[PDB]
Amino acid sequence: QSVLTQPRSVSGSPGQSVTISCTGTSSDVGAYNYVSWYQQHPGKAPKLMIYDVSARPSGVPDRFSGSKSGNTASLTISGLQAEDEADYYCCSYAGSWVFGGGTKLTVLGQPKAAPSVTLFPPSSEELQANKATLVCLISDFYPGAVTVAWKADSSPVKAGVETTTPSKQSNNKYAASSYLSLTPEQWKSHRSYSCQVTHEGSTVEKTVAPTE
Amino acid sequence: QVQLVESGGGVVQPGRSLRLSCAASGFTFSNYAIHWVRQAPGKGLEWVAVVSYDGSNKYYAESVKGRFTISRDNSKNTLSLQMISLRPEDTAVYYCASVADTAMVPEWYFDLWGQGTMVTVSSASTKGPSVFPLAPSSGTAALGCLVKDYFPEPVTVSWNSGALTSGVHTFPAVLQSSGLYSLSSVVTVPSSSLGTQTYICNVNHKPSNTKVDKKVEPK
Amino acid sequence: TNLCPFGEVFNATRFASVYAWNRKRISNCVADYSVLYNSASFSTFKCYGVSPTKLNDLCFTNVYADSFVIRGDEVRQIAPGQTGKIADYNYKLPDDFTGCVIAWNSNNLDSKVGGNYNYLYRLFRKSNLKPFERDISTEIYQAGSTPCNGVEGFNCYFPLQSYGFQPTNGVGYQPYRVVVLSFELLHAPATVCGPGLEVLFQ
Ligand SMILES: *[C@@H]1O[C@H](CO[C@@H]2O[C@@H](C)[C@@H](O)[C@@H](O)[C@@H]2O)[C@@H](O[C@@H]2O[C@H](CO)[C@@H](O)[C@H](O)[C@H]2NC(C)=O)[C@H](O)[C@H]1NC(C)=O
């Protein structure tokens, strides 16, 4: 069913402000003002940060502020601090409790690092095994939030894609991988395949084509 | 210290039944409605079900209707969730969630949370990996291997039996819907050495007693 | 000072069902009503006999605070000369009413997921209430030609109904807390007075 639409990622410099949108339908966020915002740090439960759209529970700083307009709620964090780095989820209680996709708020603590992509075609042994798999390895990026997109013959593709959640490395940058599983036939039929990783504004692309 | 404690998590096979419990302390449980909210690993929150203060009015989410049953004992101050015909899509952490007496937050918001309990619905049993060489392209080159379809974790990967270390990046694995893992290890090398040096993956999945060596060469 | 205990009726943690409306008797004190006007953000604050600016300079024998809970679209009935289930069978106000009706939205406190069935009202009554009467009887109401004999059933109804307040209603169907201040001016001494009548004693 429905999911309220939050941005996948948001980046904010420390001390400054950020705003996470949360867009729904007129039968959800517009129906009533029962909008709430939850913070979740890795491996712990959510915490209520906003309710009744703009209300702050006891013990929540006034740096967290909630607003609404039409079908869109907005959480705003001022005076950004490192502890605020976390996943944030909105929720609308109209007919049922509906959540958003979540938004990873990164509090920027290092210069931006662009991703390094390495794209591997399917091995000959795997093709012999009637299977095929393309491997897209993204490394050395920061902030730790990328969007991977597989593209066939300069056209989109979406079935068979399994992507990793960014994981911190030793150098405190992030790395992920994406596997596009295909049929030997699909691979040898198309002309080329491409992996596109979007980080901040820029996008990096790599292309593999079948060989003989 | 108002506190909610979940229990009864574990691994079940697709199609069987489990029963989670959530015990309450510190507030007037019988006075507020309480919910189950779950979160699949690495993904977002999903509201599952709620029971009124009165214990008869119960509501669920379509993804769950017909399979989960919510109940509460207001004399023991407990609540339970009986799940049946469990699918792998139900694999998740289950939190129970309500509000406290002091809070001015109404019960339609999730103010008070437990620590959760994990439910893993997986048919999968121990499988050894299958290693495939990601050959170098034809300055610098990148080669590696693909450890594919292994369970459980972990898998360990080395190169040239420990002789090669600089430039090795082994990536965290992906959980495939199947229930099985697959990871990749990549090393970056001089292109001028593809003819002379021999590059070899050394994979080891200890939970299946599987030690594999796979030679990665160009072409 | 000996000020009056309005916070005991306007901030009570629990309010009464309309049919069993509660009544506190305020006496032997001074009261600042302009403080009470700006005390909170009230949805409704209507004064009939008088107005609150003028009230700070008046003296009454006793003051009565009647308190209870009802649906938003029933607050119109808490007025003199009104008709409806509430104004005729639960809480009636005289046509010669000198007092103030105050009400505010209490959705976060009194409606509950699935319904709050503890708040009640009277649904059936042979006759209308007299002004300021309270009726808490639970005698079966005869809606047919056949007598009931104290047995519930067909055309033989239990006279009280639950509001079942829910948050997923529209405002009209949401619970509102109401306080009716009524200022009685008998022939006996004024026990309650406003603050502007201290200038005559200095
Ligand atoms: C009813 O309550 C309001 C709110 O004040 C609070 O009430 C309780 C919740 C208590 O635990 C404290 O938080 C507060 O006392 C009262 O409004 C207050 O009035 C006083 C006196 O003038 C004033 O000093 C405060 O600033 C006011 N607070 C707010 C939030 O406006 C009100 O007086 C109480 N009673 C009545 C009859 O209105």
XYZ file of C-alpha atoms and ligand atoms in Angstrom:
671
model
C 0.000 0.000 0.000
C 0.836 3.692 0.311
C 4.113 5.048 1.697
C 4.728 8.703 2.471
C 7.559 9.989 0.314
C 10.655 11.241 2.128
C 14.002 11.992 0.483
C 16.362 9.035 0.703
C 19.226 11.263 1.907
C 19.837 14.694 3.392
C 23.170 16.353 4.128
C 23.698 19.263 6.491
C 26.794 21.119 7.630
C 27.232 21.304 11.412
C 25.593 24.212 13.190
C 23.382 24.904 10.165
C 19.835 23.742 9.353
C 18.174 21.029 7.282
C 14.612 20.202 6.279
C 13.230 16.729 5.560
C 10.068 16.716 3.452
C 7.348 14.067 3.757
C 4.730 14.063 0.998
C 1.477 12.112 1.140
C -2.092 12.109 -0.169
C -5.122 14.167 0.788
C -6.428 11.004 2.509
C -3.258 10.773 4.653
C -1.270 13.852 5.644
C -4.049 16.169 4.494
C -6.876 14.264 6.183
C -5.850 15.035 9.760
C -3.003 16.743 11.592
C -1.913 13.481 13.273
C 1.610 13.804 11.916
C 4.613 12.588 13.878
C 8.365 12.398 13.375
C 10.665 9.697 14.773
C 14.449 9.527 15.081
C 16.264 6.185 14.993
C 19.956 5.660 15.676
C 21.660 2.478 14.464
C 20.533 -0.592 16.363
C 18.119 1.183 18.721
C 14.399 1.835 18.732
C 12.744 4.922 17.249
C 12.245 8.005 19.369
C 9.290 10.359 19.031
C 10.532 13.833 18.098
C 7.380 15.554 16.814
C 3.647 14.940 17.206
C 0.501 16.868 16.359
C 2.598 18.169 13.436
C 4.494 20.799 15.440
C 4.523 19.478 19.023
C 7.733 18.400 20.763
C 7.570 15.673 23.437
C 9.135 16.419 26.786
C 12.913 16.324 26.574
C 13.163 17.050 22.843
C 15.154 20.223 22.068
C 13.487 23.146 20.301
C 16.031 22.644 17.504
C 13.523 20.091 16.175
C 10.498 21.797 14.629
C 7.589 20.378 12.647
C 5.312 22.012 10.098
C 2.760 21.003 7.484
C 1.266 22.481 4.334
C -1.262 20.871 2.052
C -0.234 17.231 1.704
C 3.375 17.713 2.842
C 4.865 17.704 6.321
C 8.356 19.049 6.999
C 10.765 18.363 9.848
C 13.398 21.047 10.366
C 16.558 20.665 12.431
C 18.528 23.779 13.336
C 21.907 23.978 15.040
C 22.979 20.633 13.642
C 25.037 18.480 16.002
C 26.835 15.216 15.361
C 24.422 13.292 17.598
C 21.600 14.189 15.182
C 23.091 11.948 12.465
C 20.390 9.299 12.160
C 17.416 7.877 10.267
C 14.237 9.971 10.396
C 10.710 8.738 9.671
C 7.455 10.660 9.361
C 4.078 9.137 10.132
C 0.478 10.040 9.329
C -2.421 8.518 11.270
C -5.493 9.058 9.100
C -7.152 5.747 8.259
C -4.174 3.696 9.393
C -0.685 4.535 10.618
C 1.373 5.163 7.463
C 5.139 5.705 7.620
C 7.615 7.246 5.214
C 10.544 5.601 3.470
C 12.938 7.184 5.945
C 15.656 9.777 5.425
C 19.313 9.281 6.370
C 20.546 12.570 7.859
C 24.342 12.803 7.623
C 26.026 15.609 9.581
C 28.973 16.491 7.387
C 32.306 16.048 9.143
C 34.715 15.560 6.241
C 35.206 17.017 2.768
C 33.027 15.419 0.113
C 34.589 12.322 -1.478
C 33.373 11.176 -4.866
C 32.711 7.464 -5.444
C 35.032 5.084 -7.262
C 33.116 2.553 -9.366
C 34.428 -0.728 -10.745
C 32.068 -2.746 -12.936
C 32.706 -6.430 -13.645
C 30.909 -8.394 -16.366
C 29.844 -12.007 -15.816
C 32.543 -14.645 -15.719
C 32.778 -17.279 -18.428
C 32.402 -20.030 -15.815
C 29.149 -18.460 -14.593
C 27.813 -18.291 -18.154
C 28.714 -21.979 -18.442
C 26.558 -22.476 -15.330
C 23.539 -20.903 -17.156
C 23.700 -17.948 -14.717
C 25.062 -14.428 -15.068
C 25.836 -11.620 -12.644
C 27.224 -8.107 -13.077
C 29.102 -6.598 -10.130
C 29.243 -2.853 -9.420
C 31.586 -1.957 -6.559
C 31.408 1.589 -5.177
C 34.139 2.725 -2.796
C 35.765 5.713 -1.097
C 32.709 7.973 -1.014
C 31.356 10.449 1.536
C 28.636 11.340 2.502
C 27.599 7.715 2.830
C 24.523 7.803 0.605
C 24.475 6.756 -3.051
C 21.776 5.684 -5.492
C 22.611 2.854 -7.904
C 20.885 2.547 -11.282
C 21.306 -0.214 -13.863
C 20.822 0.691 -17.521
C 20.527 -1.615 -20.550
C 21.420 -0.351 -24.045
C 20.994 3.207 -22.674
C 17.557 2.292 -21.241
C 16.432 1.598 -17.664
C 16.424 -1.760 -15.866
C 14.995 -2.715 -12.473
C 14.460 -6.491 -11.991
C 17.292 -8.559 -10.527
C 19.044 -5.675 -8.748
C 20.319 -6.289 -5.213
C 22.145 -3.361 -3.607
C 24.034 -3.000 -0.332
C 23.466 -0.434 2.348
C 26.548 1.833 2.610
C 29.082 0.501 5.149
C 31.881 2.480 6.771
C 35.400 1.485 5.764
C 38.656 1.794 7.689
C 39.377 5.245 6.180
C 35.995 6.473 7.534
C 34.591 6.718 4.003
C 31.806 4.416 2.816
C 31.503 1.520 0.379
C 28.679 -0.481 -1.149
C 28.096 -2.998 -3.917
C 25.306 -3.765 -6.385
C 24.676 -7.097 -8.117
C 22.595 -7.314 -11.294
C 21.624 -10.943 -11.850
C 20.741 -11.818 -15.446
C 20.197 -14.749 -17.808
C 23.098 -15.733 -20.111
C 20.729 -14.886 -22.930
C 19.862 -11.405 -21.651
C 23.572 -10.614 -21.299
C 24.653 -11.844 -24.732
C 21.586 -10.262 -26.391
C 21.846 -6.582 -25.438
C 24.700 -4.415 -26.709
C 25.947 -3.014 -23.392
C 25.114 -2.613 -19.714
C 25.823 0.333 -17.432
C 26.051 0.981 -13.700
C 25.343 4.570 -12.620
C 25.996 5.648 -9.030
C 24.694 9.039 -7.946
C 26.497 10.741 -5.061
C 25.464 14.217 -3.960
C 24.849 16.003 -7.251
C 27.193 14.156 -9.562
C 26.776 10.738 -11.156
C 29.491 8.284 -12.178
C 28.906 5.641 -14.845
C 30.665 2.482 -16.006
C 29.828 0.278 -18.995
C 30.526 -3.382 -19.783
C 29.798 -5.052 -23.126
C 29.902 -8.740 -24.096
C 33.135 -10.070 -25.569
C 34.290 -12.597 -28.158
C 11.212 3.631 34.772
C 8.285 2.876 32.417
C 9.448 -0.144 30.397
C 8.191 -2.470 27.664
C 9.993 -5.776 27.091
C 9.451 -7.999 24.061
C 10.171 -11.719 24.018
C 9.636 -14.830 21.950
C 11.768 -14.027 18.926
C 13.741 -16.555 16.968
C 14.086 -18.361 13.664
C 11.074 -20.162 12.212
C 10.611 -21.917 8.926
C 8.283 -20.403 6.309
C 4.748 -21.558 7.026
C 5.051 -22.272 10.758
C 3.709 -20.237 13.687
C 5.244 -18.130 16.450
C 3.940 -16.132 19.404
C 5.548 -12.915 20.593
C 4.900 -11.321 23.963
C 5.383 -7.826 25.361
C 5.356 -7.266 29.125
C 4.782 -3.822 30.610
C 5.957 -2.163 33.810
C 5.966 1.263 35.402
C 2.692 2.743 34.133
C -1.044 2.000 33.934
C -0.973 -0.416 30.998
C -4.723 -1.085 31.117
C -5.336 2.589 30.415
C -3.738 3.073 26.986
C -3.744 1.357 23.626
C -0.631 -0.523 22.583
C 0.766 -1.363 19.153
C 3.101 -3.719 17.345
C 5.409 -2.016 14.828
C 8.037 -3.946 12.878
C 11.152 -3.180 10.842
C 12.796 -5.542 8.368
C 16.609 -5.499 8.543
C 18.049 -2.495 6.751
C 14.663 -1.061 5.789
C 11.895 1.154 7.150
C 9.163 0.996 9.761
C 5.771 -0.613 9.196
C 2.811 -0.468 11.552
C 1.494 -3.970 12.223
C -1.390 -3.904 14.681
C -2.994 -2.131 17.633
C -5.234 -3.079 20.536
C -7.449 -0.637 22.387
C -7.361 -0.055 26.095
C -10.516 -2.150 26.327
C -8.984 -5.293 24.813
C -11.754 -6.056 22.307
C -11.202 -3.427 19.583
C -8.277 -4.630 17.453
C -6.999 -3.306 14.114
C -4.352 -4.629 11.720
C -2.522 -3.756 8.506
C -3.649 -5.523 5.343
C -0.214 -7.083 4.817
C -0.895 -8.956 8.059
C -4.666 -9.520 8.330
C -5.691 -13.161 8.548
C -2.322 -14.219 9.960
C -1.522 -12.179 13.094
C -3.757 -11.946 16.162
C -3.258 -9.343 18.876
C -4.448 -9.657 22.455
C -3.898 -8.145 25.886
C -4.303 -9.260 29.498
C -5.014 -6.154 31.578
C -4.702 -8.087 34.851
C -1.243 -9.508 34.077
C -0.335 -6.287 32.181
C 0.853 -8.194 29.111
C 0.069 -8.353 25.420
C 0.670 -11.058 22.832
C 0.898 -11.408 19.054
C 0.102 -14.837 17.589
C 1.564 -15.148 14.076
C 0.809 -18.033 11.704
C 1.628 -18.991 8.114
C 4.801 -16.969 8.416
C 6.388 -15.721 5.183
C 10.020 -14.587 4.705
C 8.700 -11.012 4.080
C 7.783 -10.982 7.782
C 11.442 -11.291 8.827
C 11.899 -8.214 10.989
C 12.375 -6.737 14.435
C 9.066 -6.423 16.288
C 8.675 -3.532 18.723
C 5.715 -2.988 20.997
C 4.873 0.651 21.506
C 2.490 2.809 23.533
C 2.449 5.985 25.645
C 3.052 6.594 29.333
C 0.888 8.145 32.027
C 3.055 11.247 32.455
C 3.331 11.889 28.713
C 0.910 14.398 27.239
C 1.237 12.475 23.954
C -1.950 10.692 22.827
C -1.954 6.949 22.248
C -2.121 7.288 18.443
C 1.582 8.251 18.583
C 4.459 5.892 19.427
C 6.042 7.590 22.429
C 7.239 4.592 24.480
C 9.157 1.790 22.774
C 10.597 -1.567 23.705
C 13.984 -2.860 22.635
C 12.322 -5.165 20.097
C 12.683 -8.866 19.385
C 13.884 -10.377 16.112
C 11.865 -12.865 14.065
C 13.691 -14.556 11.189
C 11.552 -16.543 8.749
C 14.068 -18.485 6.665
C 13.981 -21.866 4.978
C 17.689 -21.551 4.299
C 20.197 -24.003 5.771
C 23.986 -24.158 5.563
C 25.222 -23.821 1.977
C 28.842 -23.617 0.920
C 29.923 -20.730 -1.301
C 30.591 -20.878 -5.025
C 33.575 -18.778 -6.130
C 33.846 -17.294 -9.632
C 36.822 -15.311 -10.999
C 36.150 -11.681 -11.941
C 38.897 -11.459 -14.540
C 40.899 -8.289 -15.243
C 40.128 -6.042 -18.167
C 42.361 -5.927 -21.233
C 48.606 1.603 -16.075
C 46.436 -0.317 -13.610
C 43.937 -3.183 -13.526
C 41.280 -4.577 -11.191
C 40.610 -8.275 -10.625
C 38.801 -10.292 -8.007
C 36.400 -13.059 -7.228
C 32.707 -13.400 -6.502
C 31.753 -15.595 -3.565
C 28.135 -16.443 -4.348
C 25.179 -18.054 -2.557
C 26.536 -18.968 0.868
C 24.908 -19.320 4.285
C 25.463 -18.571 7.086
C 27.994 -15.843 7.652
C 30.888 -15.319 7.746
C 33.099 -16.006 4.753
C 36.791 -15.133 4.838
C 38.809 -14.197 1.745
C 42.563 -13.840 1.241
C 44.849 -13.496 -1.770
C 47.968 -15.484 -2.649
C 47.652 -17.165 0.766
C 48.353 -13.977 2.698
C 51.220 -12.834 0.480
C 49.023 -10.182 -1.190
C 47.492 -7.604 1.150
C 48.001 -4.089 -0.201
C 45.100 -3.129 -2.444
C 42.644 -5.827 -1.322
C 39.105 -4.601 -0.640
C 36.567 -7.251 0.355
C 33.053 -5.879 0.263
C 30.310 -6.547 2.812
C 27.872 -9.143 1.553
C 24.333 -8.699 0.258
C 21.370 -10.557 1.702
C 19.478 -11.911 -1.313
C 15.713 -12.441 -1.021
C 16.586 -16.132 -1.410
C 17.996 -16.108 2.115
C 21.644 -16.532 1.026
C 24.654 -14.201 0.948
C 27.066 -13.144 -1.800
C 30.210 -11.007 -1.472
C 33.004 -9.791 -3.741
C 36.719 -9.283 -3.184
C 38.731 -6.999 -5.456
C 42.434 -6.259 -5.719
C 44.002 -3.510 -7.825
C 47.303 -4.416 -9.483
C 49.818 -3.170 -12.039
C 48.611 -4.016 -15.528
C 52.224 -4.892 -16.415
C 52.115 -7.918 -14.086
C 49.167 -9.867 -15.514
C 51.516 -12.159 -17.418
C 54.098 -12.564 -14.669
C 52.355 -12.619 -11.276
C 49.728 -15.228 -10.383
C 46.659 -13.925 -8.530
C 44.601 -16.465 -6.564
C 41.535 -16.179 -4.316
C 41.483 -18.186 -1.080
C 37.906 -18.476 0.185
C 36.990 -20.142 3.467
C 33.394 -20.729 4.729
C 34.061 -22.426 8.122
C 30.382 -23.188 8.935
C 30.276 -25.552 5.914
C 33.901 -26.806 6.065
C 34.568 -25.333 2.613
C 38.059 -24.089 1.586
C 38.291 -23.063 -2.111
C 41.110 -21.620 -4.231
C 40.287 -19.888 -7.524
C 42.861 -18.561 -9.986
C 42.062 -15.221 -11.627
C 43.747 -14.614 -14.990
C 43.023 -12.289 -17.926
C 40.825 -13.135 -20.910
C -6.073 37.150 48.871
C -8.285 34.069 49.334
C -8.720 33.569 45.589
C -11.224 31.170 44.050
C -10.412 27.578 43.020
C -11.035 27.624 39.278
C -7.990 25.473 38.532
C -9.744 22.740 40.515
C -12.572 22.599 37.941
C -10.942 23.811 34.692
C -7.813 21.640 34.999
C -9.296 18.561 36.666
C -7.604 15.482 35.258
C -11.020 13.814 34.803
C -14.411 15.266 33.825
C -17.912 13.867 34.270
C -20.329 12.402 31.759
C -22.930 14.932 30.709
C -25.909 13.128 32.223
C -24.152 12.958 35.616
C -22.668 16.436 35.243
C -20.502 17.536 38.148
C -21.081 20.707 40.165
C -18.598 22.513 42.419
C -19.772 25.371 44.650
C -17.404 28.350 44.689
C -17.878 30.595 47.719
C -16.142 32.964 50.178
C -13.425 34.160 47.820
C -12.370 36.692 45.203
C -12.157 35.824 41.523
C -10.277 37.387 38.604
C -12.328 36.561 35.504
C -10.104 38.456 33.063
C -7.336 36.085 34.138
C -9.674 33.192 33.354
C -10.472 34.611 29.904
C -6.795 34.752 28.896
C -5.911 31.755 31.092
C -6.065 29.394 28.113
C -7.188 29.315 24.479
C -10.851 28.347 24.813
C -12.836 27.328 21.751
C -15.977 28.819 23.314
C -16.430 31.540 25.953
C -19.941 33.014 25.785
C -21.454 35.092 28.583
C -25.178 35.756 28.646
C -26.261 37.918 31.563
C -23.028 39.879 31.597
C -19.473 40.176 30.229
C -16.117 39.379 31.867
C -14.750 42.952 31.937
C -17.803 43.928 33.986
C -17.590 40.750 36.084
C -14.455 41.879 37.921
C -16.540 44.524 39.735
C -19.557 42.452 40.814
C -20.577 40.446 43.875
C -22.701 37.284 43.917
C -24.094 35.104 46.685
C -22.514 31.910 45.331
C -20.999 30.794 42.046
C -21.539 27.338 40.565
C -19.188 25.527 38.187
C -21.002 22.726 36.378
C -18.575 20.562 34.392
C -18.911 17.725 31.879
C -17.956 16.368 28.427
C -19.876 16.305 25.119
C -19.493 16.299 21.332
C -18.375 19.558 19.750
C -21.599 19.977 17.757
C -23.531 19.615 21.017
C -21.968 22.694 22.624
C -24.530 24.838 20.807
C -27.087 23.130 23.055
C -25.380 24.365 26.239
C -27.193 27.687 25.911
C -30.477 29.098 27.222
C -33.611 28.147 25.323
C -32.039 25.365 23.251
C -33.369 21.946 22.260
C -31.730 18.594 21.583
C -30.849 15.348 23.351
C -28.389 17.236 25.548
C -30.375 20.383 26.300
C -33.606 18.481 26.973
C -32.475 15.224 28.631
C -29.061 15.936 30.190
C -28.273 19.583 30.974
C -30.931 22.307 30.714
C -30.338 26.030 31.087
C -32.931 28.606 32.193
C -34.108 31.247 29.779
C -33.160 33.793 32.487
C -29.592 32.461 32.651
C -26.962 34.861 34.025
C -23.668 33.047 33.508
C -20.931 31.956 31.127
C -20.507 28.804 29.042
C -16.860 27.844 28.465
C -15.683 24.902 26.383
C -12.485 23.621 24.823
C -11.425 20.741 22.598
C -10.287 17.742 24.671
C -9.510 15.264 21.899
C -5.979 14.415 23.052
C -7.279 13.573 26.554
C -10.659 11.890 26.159
C -10.944 10.136 22.793
C -9.206 6.767 22.484
C -8.214 4.455 19.651
C -11.280 2.339 18.961
C -13.538 4.535 21.088
C -13.739 5.790 24.669
C -16.841 4.094 26.075
C -16.615 5.596 29.577
C -18.245 8.907 28.626
C -22.036 8.678 28.499
C -25.199 10.640 27.838
C -28.912 10.120 28.318
C -30.610 9.077 25.077
C -34.258 8.573 26.133
C -36.556 10.421 28.516
C -40.324 10.613 28.873
C -40.154 14.354 29.611
C -37.747 17.250 29.310
C -35.515 18.243 32.195
C -36.246 21.332 34.227
C -33.478 23.963 34.244
C -30.418 22.768 36.191
C -31.969 19.368 36.942
C -29.761 16.260 37.023
C -31.108 12.784 36.225
C -29.017 9.662 36.846
C -31.797 7.048 36.936
C -31.366 3.953 34.744
C -35.000 2.868 34.444
C -35.955 1.162 31.195
C -37.647 3.543 28.749
C -40.953 2.419 27.215
C -40.907 3.188 23.476
C -43.957 1.097 22.563
C -47.528 0.414 23.658
C -46.566 -2.675 25.737
C -45.112 -1.925 29.203
C -41.547 -2.998 29.936
C -41.637 -4.183 33.573
C -37.964 -3.341 34.055
C -36.854 -5.798 31.346
C -34.677 -4.566 28.492
C -35.505 -5.636 24.961
C -37.720 -4.602 22.058
C -39.070 -1.047 22.355
C -37.718 -1.290 25.929
C -34.428 0.577 26.016
C -31.631 1.233 28.447
C -31.709 5.050 28.563
C -27.942 5.780 28.469
C -25.572 5.612 25.499
C -21.801 5.764 25.179
C -20.169 8.540 23.184
C -17.375 6.291 21.915
C -15.037 9.194 21.220
C -12.499 8.484 18.488
C -9.664 10.621 17.139
C -10.439 9.700 13.527
C -13.683 11.679 13.697
C -14.147 15.201 12.464
C -14.044 17.960 15.060
C -17.824 17.985 15.419
C -17.738 14.397 16.715
C -14.712 15.002 19.052
C -14.951 15.295 22.847
C -15.123 18.796 24.288
C -14.830 19.688 27.959
C -17.402 22.193 29.189
C -17.677 24.350 32.313
C -20.806 26.412 32.984
C -20.344 29.221 35.483
C -23.678 30.347 36.919
C -23.826 33.408 39.183
C -26.622 33.258 41.747
C -27.688 36.532 43.371
C -29.966 35.536 46.256
C -31.000 37.774 49.159
C -28.093 36.416 51.248
C -24.625 37.980 51.482
C -22.250 37.921 48.555
C -19.643 35.259 49.285
C -17.872 35.532 45.900
C -16.682 38.907 44.632
C -14.539 40.412 41.918
C -11.277 42.240 42.509
C -12.405 45.751 41.536
C -14.425 46.048 44.755
C -11.353 46.400 46.966
C -11.005 50.089 46.076
C -14.062 50.823 48.240
C -12.105 49.572 51.287
C -8.823 51.510 51.023
C -4.885 25.583 34.483
O -3.570 25.316 33.975
C -2.932 26.418 33.310
C -1.556 25.938 32.913
O -0.625 26.152 33.967
C -0.019 24.890 34.323
O -0.962 24.000 34.911
C -0.453 22.710 35.365
C -0.292 21.839 34.111
C 0.841 22.823 36.219
O 1.450 21.544 36.319
C 1.844 23.829 35.625
O 2.388 23.252 34.436
C 1.158 25.147 35.287
O 0.745 25.815 36.471
C -2.865 27.636 34.226
O -2.311 28.745 33.532
C -1.243 29.262 34.346
O -1.703 30.281 35.242
C -0.695 30.802 36.125
C -1.377 31.817 37.017
O -1.766 32.978 36.297
C 0.466 31.390 35.320
O 1.495 31.815 36.208
C 1.011 30.357 34.339
O 2.018 30.929 33.511
C -0.117 29.794 33.475
N 0.392 28.776 32.570
C 0.034 28.696 31.284
C 0.651 27.579 30.496
O -0.752 29.490 30.780
C -4.248 27.973 34.760
O -4.171 29.054 35.683
C -4.828 26.755 35.452
N -6.130 27.053 36.028
C -7.062 27.793 35.418
C -8.334 27.995 36.183
O -6.894 28.267 34.298
